Ligand binder design. Structure first.
Ligand code: HEM
Length: 405
């Protein structure tokens, strides 16, 4: 259950939050993590759950920590400690300066110039999927659209066969929202086990897919090793399969319950990109962290070298000190303050691909199925972890209120 309180951690700063099953989960995951911003909760607390660790609860602290890599290192970014010690993905497990050389390489495979190229492809797939669903007046969103749409796009970007999707996604989910059937370490090993032969192959005979791009690449002008290429390709895999997939579900669940919000985007589709930022803020879903490199006093609190600290990227934008009425989705919100794609030198490299996928989904779906809702009796369930998700999303709609385009 709870790890004993280390001697240096003040008893009054204890707030036993469990990031993998928070107490108020039933009210929605975002709402569940928002209990850390309750009236009598401090900016920095210590939880005894999951081996024991700090949690910064406010945007001000989360951004500061993310900026100061000298004290808050990416070397051990996952909780529990076992998992963060085993976590060696590139470039996430590395801090500046040696970190940058790899971001540049990774930005060649998912960056903006690559996203633009992907445009038509992305629309074709979203339009393909929706039109096929349109006449049926129902669908379970997670399996019929949230997963296939982004995953097939990445599998194509990666040059990897779709048949391997069931296996890879299972490994991916074990890493972010563990089943208990395997440790982060075991799931990482399998991921690596899958990539090793593929990377050797792409190096032997170079293709134009993200995998061979990475594996035949250079960093700081020098050849990348097979091992560095594996560590980086596995992280790319995590991003392509378990991020947008979940976010699309939180947004669509919201739209299914918000006729007025849908009418706004139906009426002025030009508000869709704005609406995407506000949904990215409101349905923020990532939370990883750092490890203290040395004894350090932070905001009046004594941190010790080795202490792990959770810096929920999700929390910043729900922080009322950044955005008034944080839980209200306001497509017109004047300043949408968030750290959904992270903060600091580790800013998400897939963010551009992620927005495209979102804006396109929103645009192509609202245009064909403007009116829909959540299947009657459905008790939508959320799931929490490094990356939070939606268990199932049964949608229903009257076919006669739809249009083909
Ligand atoms: C809604 C979608 C997404 C969200 C909210 C998101 C969020 C994040 C966050 C919060 C981080 C920072 C982690 C840290 O600082 O420890 C990150 C890093 C990263 N993400 Fe994204 N991500 C998304 C989609 C994607 C996609 C689609 C990809 C590519 C397949 C991707 C690739 C990466 C990579 C390569 C990094 C590491 C950057 C580094 O460590 O320098 N992400 N992402």
């Amino acid at each position: 259950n709870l790890a004993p309180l280390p001697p240096h951690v003040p008893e009054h700063l204890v707030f036993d939050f469990d990031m993998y099953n928070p107490s108020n989960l039933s009210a929605g995951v975002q709402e569940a993590w928002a209990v850390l911003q309750e009236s009598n909760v401090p900016d920095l607390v210590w939880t005894r759950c999951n081996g024991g660790h700090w949690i910064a609860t406010r945007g001000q602290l989360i951004r500061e920590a993310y900026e100061d890599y000298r004290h808050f290192s990416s070397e051990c970014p996952w909780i529990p400690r076992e998992a963060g010690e085993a976590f060696d993905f590139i470039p996430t497990s590395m801090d500046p300066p040696e970190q940058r050389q790899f971001r540049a390489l990774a930005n060649q495979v998912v960056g903006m110039p690559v996203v633009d190229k992907l445009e038509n492809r992305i629309q074709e797939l979203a339009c393909s999927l929706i039109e096929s669903l349109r006449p049926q007046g129902q669908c379970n969103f997670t399996e019929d659209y949230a997963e296939p749409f982004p995953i097939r796009i990445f599998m194509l970007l990666a040059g990897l066969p779709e048949e391997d999707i069931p296996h890879l996604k299972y490994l991916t989910d074990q890493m972010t929202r563990p089943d208990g059937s395997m440790t982060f370490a075991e799931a990482k090993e399998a991921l690596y086990d899958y990539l090793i032969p593929i990377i050797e192959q792409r190096r032997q005979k170079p293709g134009t897919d993200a995998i061979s791009i990475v594996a035949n690449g250079q960093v700081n002008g020098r050849p990348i090793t097979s091992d560095e290429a594996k560590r980086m390709c596995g992280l790319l895999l995590v991003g392509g399969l378990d991020t947008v997939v979940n976010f699309l579900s939180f947004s669509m669940e919201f739209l299914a319950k918000s006729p007025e919000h849908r009418q706004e985007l139906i009426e002025r589709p030009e508000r869709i990109p704005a609406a995407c930022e506000e949904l990215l803020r409101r349905f923020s879903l990532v939370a990883d962290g750092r490890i203290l490199t040395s004894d350090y006093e932070f905001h009046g609190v004594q941190l010790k070298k080795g202490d792990q600290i959770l810096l929920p990227q999700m929390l910043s934008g729900l922080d009322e000190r950044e955005n008034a009425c944080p839980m209200h989705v306001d497509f017109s919100r004047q300043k949408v303050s968030h750290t959904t794609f992270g903060h600091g030198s580790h800013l998400c490299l897939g963010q551009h691909l992620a927005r495209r996928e979102i804006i396109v989904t929103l645009k192509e779906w609202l245009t064909r199925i403007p009116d829909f809702s959540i299947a009657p009796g459905a008790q939508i369930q959320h799931k929490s972890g490094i990356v939070s998700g939606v268990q199932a999303l049964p949608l229903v709609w009257d076919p006669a209120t739809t249009k083909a385009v």
